[PDB]
C-alpha cells in the first residue's frame, strides 16, 4: 500500500533488506531502487552517499529521511536498521512535497516496527561474519622495484649504478644493442648507520587484517485492540580490514501507542537512543601504503618503527600511522524521539499534534604522538585535542484532516502547520608538551605547552503552511492538489516566504467497463504529476557580509592560514600580537528559494492475477534559481564568494521495475525482481566565475554549461610512439620521444598545446540495473542479488601510479606490478609508455589515458538459509527457528578495458571486503 498512490513512490521490501545484514539500511538497498544511486566506500560504519534522480542542484544533495514522521538528514548508519517495518522512497516532487520543505532531493520514508494487534512476538537475531580484504593492489617487491628502476635508468640513458639506493646492477647489451639486466644486488643496510636493514615488506598485507563483525538484536512487540508497544535492543560491532579501525553501536528503541475513551485521544510515541564508538582510518592511508617502497622494513634494528633513510622517498610508515591513530576514538550519542497526540471530534475529523526531537552529542579526543621514522619526524611534537559537538533539532507539527465518502466521491482535505528548529555548536581545547605519551596521561590539565581554544555555533529555523486535497471518483479517477508556503531564517524578510504548488492525476484504466474481457490484465494505472519544490540547503550565514577575527590559532598546511596577527612592533613575538578582522564572504540580500519543477509520467501494470507486476516511469526535473556560492572575480580578493540564484539544471530519466513470482509443480517458489534505470544530466545556466574556476566540471579550461555535471576536459592519447619516424610524422610537441604518449592534434595547427583539449570524462552511466532472485524449496530459501552498472567512465588515479615511473610529486615511489610490462625495444607488444625518470612529455596531464570503463556487474549479496520444521520448533517452544549463511561482495565481473580492480572504488578510498556471515533467527 503506497502512501500516495498517485506519485513516483518505490516500496522496498524490508525482509530482503535485513538479509544482507548491513548496519546501514540505506546501504542495503544500494541497487534495489530505480533512479537512486548509493555509493559506499567500505568503512566499518555504514556511512554512504545517496543521490535520488541524479544530481538535482548545485547544493547539498542528500535526501530528507523521515523516521516516524520526524524529518532528518543525518545518516542511518548511527541508527538501528533492524526494527524497520516499511521503507518508501518518494522520488516525485508532487508526492514528496507534503512531507517537508526539504524534499527537493527526494524523501525516504522509514516506518519503525510497532506491536501487532492482539498478539506478542519476540525475535532474537545473531550474526557473526568474517570480512576479508580482496582488492589487494599489486605493487612491486624489492627485486621488481630494482628492475623497474634499472629499466628507467637505461631508458633515460643514464648510469643505473648511480641510483644511490644500494642497488648494484650487473647488466650488458644484447646482439641488437638493447640493454639487458643480468642480476642485481643490494646493500644489507639502507643507511651507513646500520639502523635500517633491507627487507621485502608487503605493506598492504602488513596494514590489513581479517575483520570480525558481530550483530545481536532482540526485539519484542506487543499489540492489543486497545493499545500497543515495542521494545528493541541492538548491538553491532565491525572491525575493518585496515588495522586499528573499528565501529561499534548500541541501540535501544521504545515505541508505544494508547487509545483512550473509545477512539478519541490516541497518544503515541517513538524513541530511540544510540551510542556509536568509532576509530576511523587516517586520510590517505592506502595512498601511503602504495607509495612507500617495499625495501623499507617495518621495524628498525633497535625495535623502533622503520622509515626512509638516505635517498629513499619521504613517506611515513603506514603501520606506524595506524598504531598512532588507534587512540583517536570518538563517541557519538544519537537521540531520535517523537510524541504525538491525535483527537477525533467525530468520524471524519482528525487533529494531530506532533513533537519530534533529535539530539546528537559527539565527544572526541585526538592525540599527536612524537614519531621518528628514519628521516620522517615531527620534531618530537606531542599534543591532545579534546573536541565536543552538540546538535539539537526539534519540530512541531499540527495536522487537521477531514474525510468524506459522499456516494462514489471520496474527498480528503488536510491542512498543516510545521516548525523546524535546529541549533548546532562545537568547542575544542588543544594542549601540547606531554611527557608520558599515553592516552591515560594525555589530558589538557597534564599538558605543559601552548594551549588553544576553538568554538563556534550556528542554527536555523523553518516555518511551513501546507495543504493537500485528494479527490477520488468511482475509485477510478484520482486528483491531488498540494500547496506549500515555506519560509526560512536563511533569507531576508522580503524573500523569506515562497509558494510551491503541485498537481497529480491518475486513471485506473482497468476499472473502465470497456475491457472486462481482458482477464489476463489484472490491473493497469496511468498517472501524471507536475510539482514545484523549494530548496534552501545553503550556509546559515549566506546573506551577511562576514567579517571574522581570524587570529590564526587554527592549524594550516603550507602556512596559508590567512590569520590576522602581525608583530607591528617588531619584537619577534613574546606576547599577544595586535589582531583585526578579515572578510569571509560578501552578503547578498536578494537570495531566495531555489525552485525545482518536476514532471513525472508513470504506468503501473499487474498481469496474471498479481503474478507479473511492474512500473515504468519517465521524469523531467528542472532546477532554476539555484543558490550557488560564486567565487570572486579574482581581483575582488578574499571573501569575494557570495550566494546567488544563477543556476539551472536539467535531468531526464527513465525507470523500469518488473517482478514475477510463481510456484512450481514439484514445490519450488521463485520470485524475480528486476530493475533498470537511466538518466541524463545537463547544466543550462551557470555564473561566469563558477564556470571559469571549473568547480562543477571543465577543469577550468572550458565552461561546463551545456554538458553533464562533473564532466572533465582533457587531452586525447593516440597510443604511444614506437619509432623516430612516428615522432617526426606526428605534430610537434614538447617532450616527444620514442615510447612516449602521443597526443592528438584537435585543431590541426601542427603543435600540441593547451588548446588541444576536449570533453573526455562524463560521470553518467548508460544504465544501472539490479536483479533479486528468491527461491524457496523444502525449507530452503536462497537469495541472490546482482547489481550492474553499464556505460560509466572513471578517472583512475591508481593508474597514474601504476603505468608510469616518476609520475608523482616525489620520485622513487613504489608503483604497480603492471609497470613491469612497459614498452621497450625488447618488448614491443605493449601500450604502457616506456619508463623514464623525467616527465618531459608531461604525462600527468588530464587525458583519455586515465579514463577507464567502469562498467561492472557484482553479486552484492547471496544467502542460503534453512528453516527448522515447525514440529521441532514447536517442541522447542520456538515459533520460528532459522539458520543462514551469506556472502556479500563475493564475486564481480569487470570490463577488460579497466586495468585496475574494484571498479566501484577505483581510487585510494576505503577498500570493499568480502563478507562471509553465519546467522540465526529465533522466534520464541
Ligand X SMILES: OC[C@H]1O[C@@](CO)(OC[C@H]2O[C@@](CO)(OC[C@H]3O[C@@](CO)(OC[C@H]4O[C@](O)(CO)[C@@H](O)[C@@H]4O)[C@@H](O)[C@@H]3O)[C@@H](O)[C@@H]2O)[C@@H](O)[C@@H]1O
User: Rule CB under 6 A: which residues touch ligand X?
Assistant: 47, 74-75, 78, 332, 360, 362, 389, 391, 424
Partner in contact with 756, chosen from ligand X, a copy of itself, Mg ion, none, beta carbon below 5 to 8 Å by kind: Mg ion
Whole-angstrom distance, CA of residue 42 vs CA of residue 46: 8
How is residue 835 annotated by DSSP?
Answer: P
* Partner touching 747 among a copy of itself, ligand X, Mg ion, none, CB below 5 to 8 Å by kind: Mg ion
Site for a copy of itself in 291-310 (CB under 8 A): none
- Can you give the C-alpha Rg of the chain in angstroms? 31
Residues touching a copy of itself: how many (CB under 8 A)?
A: 68
Q: Which is nearer to ligand X, 340 or 391 (CB)?
A: 391
Return phi, psi of residue 313, to 5°.
Answer: -65, 150
- Look at the alpha carbons of 195, 198, 199, 201 in this order and tell me if their dihedral is positive or negative: positive
Query: Does the annotation place 246 within a ligand binding site?
Result: no
Q: Residue 98 gets which letter from DSSP?
A: G
753 annotated among ligand-binding-site residues: yes
716 or 784, CB closer to Mg ion? 716
Compute φ and ψ for 425, nearest 5 degrees.
-150, 160
**Rounded Cα distance, 76 and 216, in Å:** 18
Distances in Å between the Cα of 584 and the Cα atoms of 536, 548, 635 are 20, 7, 15
Here the cell at position 679 is 538518466
Residue 228: all three cell numbers together: 500497543
User: Please, which residues have CB within 8 angstroms of residue 784's CB and are 6 or more apart in sequence?
Assistant: 772, 773, 859, 861, 862, 863
Least distance (Å) between residue 566 CB and a copy of itself? 12
Between 722 and 744, name the residue whose CB sits nearer to Mg ion: 744
Is there binding between residue 736 and Mg ion (CB under 5 A)?
no
Q: What is the DSSP annotation of 408-421? A: TEEEEEEEEEEEEE
Asked whether position 745 contacts Mg ion by CB under 5 A, the answer is: yes
Residue 265 contacts which entry, a copy of itself, ligand X, Mg ion, none (Cβ below 5-8 A, type-dependent): a copy of itself
Residue 277 sits in the site that holds a copy of itself (CB under 8 A): no
- Give the HSE-up count for residue 350: Cα atoms under 13 Å, Cβ half-sphere: 19
State how far Cα 496 lies from the chain centre: 32
Q: Please report how close the Cβ of residue 435 comes to a copy of itself at its closest, in angstroms.
A: 7
Q: Which does 616 bind (CB under 5 to 8 A by kind): a copy of itself, ligand X, Mg ion, none?
A: none
Q: According to the binding rule CB under 5 A, does residue 749 interact with Mg ion?
A: yes
DSSP 3-state assignment of 643?
strand
Q: Does residue number 803 form part of the binding site for Mg ion (CB under 5 A)?
A: no
Burial bucket for residue 809 (CB in 10 Å: 0-12, 13-18, 19+): exposed
> Which residues, including other chains, have CB under 8 Å from residue 261's CB and lie 6 or more apart?
none
* Residue corresponding to grid cell 633513510: 309
Residue nearest to ligand X according to CB distances in the complex: 75
745 labeled part of a ligand binding site: yes
Asked if 743 is part of the footprint of Mg ion (rule: CB under 5 A), the reply reads no
**Is 541 a residue that touches a copy of itself (CB under 8 A)?**
no
**Residue 428 within binding range of a copy of itself, rule CB under 8 A:** yes
Is 549 one of the binding residues for a copy of itself (CB under 8 A)?
yes
Cα 347 from Cα 114, distance rounded (Å): 24
Decide which of ligand X, a copy of itself, Mg ion, none touches 427; Cβ closer than 5 to 8 Å per partner kind: a copy of itself
Helices in 682-775 by DSSP H: which ranges? 688-693, 724-729
Total count of residues recorded for the chain:
924
Minimum distance from CB of 87 to a copy of itself (Å)? Answer: 25
For the bound state, the minimum distance from the C-beta of residue 77 to a copy of itself, rounded and expressed in Å, comes to 21
Distance from C-alpha of 673 to C-alpha of 770, rounded to nearest angstrom: 8
- Residue 332 touches which of Mg ion, ligand X, a copy of itself, none (Cβ within 5-8 Å per kind): ligand X
Interacting residues with a copy of itself between 167 and 226 (CB under 8 A): 220, 222, 224, 226
Q: Which is nearer to a copy of itself, 454 or 520 (CB)?
A: 454
Instruction: Identify which of residues 613 and 715 has a Cβ nearer to Mg ion in the complex.
Output: 715
Q: Say if residue 92 carries a ligand binding annotation.
A: no
Residue 718 binds Mg ion (CB under 5 A): no
Nearer to a copy of itself, 372 or 553 (CB): 553
- Closer to Mg ion at the Cβ: 555 or 747? 747
**Which positions touch Mg ion (CB under 5 A)?**
745, 747, 749, 756
Which residue numbers belong to the known binding site for Mg(2+)? 572, 745, 747, 749, 751, 753, 756
Amino acid at each position: 500500500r503506497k502512501a500516495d498512490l498517485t506519485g513516483a513512490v518505490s516500496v522496498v521490501k524490508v525482509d530482503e533488506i535485513q538479509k544482507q545484514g548491513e548496519n546501514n539500511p540505506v546501504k542495503a538497498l544500494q541497487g534495489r531502487v530505480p533512479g537512486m544511486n548509493i555509493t559506499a566506500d567500505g568503512n566499518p560504519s555504514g556511512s554512504a552517499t545517496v543521490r535520488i534522480r541524479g544530481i538535482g542542484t548545485l547544493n547539498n544533495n542528500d535526501p530528507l529521511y523521515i523516521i516516524d514522521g520526524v524529518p532528518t538528514k543525518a545518516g542511518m548508519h548511527e541508527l538501528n536498521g533492524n526494527d524497520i517495518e516499511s521503507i518508501q522512497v518518494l522520488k516525485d516532487a508532487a508526492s514528496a512535497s507534503i512531507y517537508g520543505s526539504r524534499a527537493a532531493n527526494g524523501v525516504i520514508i522509514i516506518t519503525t516496527k510497532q506491536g501487532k494487534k492482539g498478539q506478542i512476538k519476540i525475535n532474537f537475531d545473531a550474526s557473526v561474519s568474517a570480512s576479508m580484504y580482496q582488492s589487494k593492489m599489486n605493487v612491486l617487491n624489492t627485486e621488481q622495484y630494482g628492475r623497474a628502476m634499472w629499466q628507467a635508468y637505461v631508458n633515460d640513458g643514464e648510469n643505473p649504478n648511480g641510483n644511490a639506493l644500494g642497488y648494484a646492477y650487473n647488466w650488458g647489451y644484447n646482439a641488437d644493442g638493447n640493454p639487458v639486466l643480468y642480476g642485481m644486488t643490494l646493500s644489507k643496510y639502507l643507511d651507513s648507520k646500520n639502523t635500517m636493514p633491507v627487507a621485502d615488506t608487503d605493506w598492504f598485507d602488513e596494514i590489513t587484517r581479517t575483520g570480525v563483525i558481530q550483530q545481536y538484536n532482540l526485539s519484542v512487540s506487543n499489540g492489543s485492540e486497545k493499545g500497543s508497544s515495542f521494545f528493541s535492543l541492538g548491538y553491532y560491532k565491525n572491525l575493518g580490514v585496515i588495522k586499528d579501525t573499528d565501529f561499534d553501536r548500541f541501540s535501544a528503541r521504545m515505541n508505544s501507542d494508547y487509545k483512550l475513551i473509545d477512539d478519541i485521544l490516541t497518544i503515541g510515541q517513538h524513541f530511540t537512543l544510540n551510542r556509536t564508538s568509532e576509530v576511523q582510518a587516517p586520510g590517505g592511508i592506502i595512498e601511503t601504503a602504495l607509495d612507500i617502497p617495499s625495501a623499507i622494513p617495518v621495524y628498525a634494528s633497535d625495535g623502533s618503527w622503520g622509515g626512509p633513510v638516505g635517498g629513499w622517498p619521504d613517506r611515513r610508515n603506514p603501520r606506524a600511522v595506524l598504531e598512532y591513530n588507534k587512540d583517536n576514538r570518538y563517541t557519538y550519542w544519537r537521540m531520535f524521539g517523537d510524541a504525538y497526540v491525535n483527537l477525533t471530534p467525530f468520524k471524519g475529523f482528525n487533529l494531530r499534534s506532533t513533537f519530534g526531537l533529535d539530539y546528537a552529542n559527539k565527544q572526541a579526543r585526538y592525540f599527536t604522538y612524537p614519531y621518528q621514522e628514519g628521516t620522517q619526524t615531527n620534531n618530537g611534537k606531542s599534543a591532545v585535542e579534546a573536541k565536543q559537538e552538540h546538535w539539537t533539532k526539534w519540530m512541531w507539527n499540527a495536522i487537521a484532516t477531514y474525510q468524506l465518502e459522499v456516494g462514489k466521491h471520496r474527498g480528503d482535505v488536510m491542512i498543516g502547520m510545521e516548525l523546524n528548529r535546529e541549533d548546532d555548536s562545537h568547542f575544542s581545547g588543544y594542549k601540547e608538551d606531554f611527557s608520558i605519551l599515553t592516552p591515560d596521561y594525555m589530558w589538557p590539565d597534564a599538558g605543559s605547552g601552548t594551549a588553544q581554544a576553538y568554538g563556534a555555533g550556528e542554527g536555523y529555523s523553518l516555518v511551513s503552511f501546507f495543504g493537500k486535497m485528494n479527490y477520488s471518483y468511482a475509485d477510478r479517477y484520482l486528483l491531488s492538489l498540494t500547496l506549500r508556503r515555506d519560509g526560512s531564517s536563511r533569507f531576508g524578510k522580503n524573500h523569506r516566504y515562497a509558494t510551491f504548488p503541485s498537481v497529480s492525476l491518475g486513471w485506473r484504466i482497468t476499472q473502465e467497463n470497456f475491457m472486462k474481457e481482458l482477464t489476463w490484465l489484472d490491473d493497469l494505472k496511468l498517472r501524471a504529476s507536475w510539482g514545484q519544490t523549494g530548496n534552501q540547503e545553503i550556509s546559515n550565514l549566506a546573506r551577511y557580509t562576514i567579517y571574522a577575527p581570524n587570529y590564526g590559532t587554527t592549524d594550516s598546511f603550507g602556512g596559508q592560514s590567512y590569520g590576522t596577527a602581525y608583530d607591528i612592533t617588531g619584537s619577534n613575538g613574546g606576547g599577544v600580537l595586535p589582531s583585526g578582522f578579515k572578510r569571509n564572504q560578501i552578503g547578498n540580500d536578494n537570495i531566495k528559494w531555489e525552485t525545482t519543477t518536476q514532471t513525472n509520467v508513470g504506468i503501473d501494470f499487474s498481469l496474471f492475477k498479481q503474478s507479473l507486476y511492474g512500473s515504468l516511469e519517465y521524469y523531467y526535473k528542472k532546477a532554476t534559481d539555484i543558490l550557488t556560492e560564486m567565487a570572486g572575480v579574482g581581483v575582488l580578493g578574499e571573501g569575494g564568494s557570495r550566494w546567488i540564484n544563477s543556476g539551472a539544471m536539467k535531468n531526464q530519466g527513465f525507470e523500469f521495475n518488473l517482478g514475477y513470482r510463481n510456484k512450481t509443480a514439484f514445490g519450488l517458489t521463485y520470485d524475480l525482481n528486476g530493475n533498470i534505470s537511466t538518466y541524463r544530466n545537463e547544466i543550462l545556466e551557470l555564473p561566469e566565475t563558477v564556470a571559469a574556476n571549473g568547480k562543477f566540471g571543465g577543469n577550468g579550461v572550458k565552461s561546463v554549461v551545456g554538458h553533464t555535471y562533473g564532466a572533465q576536459v582533457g587531452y586525447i592519447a593516440d597510443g604511444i610512439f614506437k619509432s623516430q619516424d612516428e615522432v617526426d610524422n606526428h605534430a610537434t610537441q614538447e617532450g616527444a620521444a620514442v615510447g612516449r604518449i602521443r597526443y592528438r592534434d584537435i585543431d590541426h595547427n601542427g603543435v600540441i598545446d593547451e588548446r588541444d583539449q576536449n570533453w573526455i570524462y562524463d560521470p553518467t552511466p548508460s544504465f544501472s540495473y539490479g536483479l533479486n532472485i528468491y527461491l524457496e524449496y523444502k525449507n530452503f530459501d536462497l537469495t541472490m542479488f546482482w547489481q550492474g552498472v553499464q556505460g560509466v567512465d572513471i578517472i583512475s588515479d591508481v593508474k597514474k601510479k601504476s603505468d608510469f615511473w616518476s609520475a608523482s610529486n616525489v620520485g622513487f615511489l613504489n608503483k604497480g606490478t603492471r609497470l613491469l610490462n612497459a614498452w621497450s625495444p625488447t618488448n614491443p607488444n605493449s601500450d604502457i609508455p616506456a619508463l623514464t625518470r623525467s616527465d618531459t612529455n608531461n604525462e600527468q596531464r588530464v587525458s583519455t589515458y586515465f579514463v577507464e570503463n567502469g562498467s561492472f556487474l557484482k553479486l552484492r549479496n547471496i544467502q542460503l538459509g534453512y528453516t527448522v520444521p515447525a514440529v521441532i520448533s514447536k517442541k522447542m517452544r520456538m515459533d520460528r527457528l532459522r539458520f543462514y549463511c551469506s556472502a556479500q561482495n563475493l564475486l564481480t565481473i569487470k570490463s577488460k578495458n579497466f586495468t585496475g580492480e574494484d571498479p566501484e572504488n577505483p581510487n585510494f578510498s576505503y577498500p570493499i571486503p568480502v563478507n562471509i556471515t553465519f546467522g540465526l533467527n529465533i522466534g520464541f
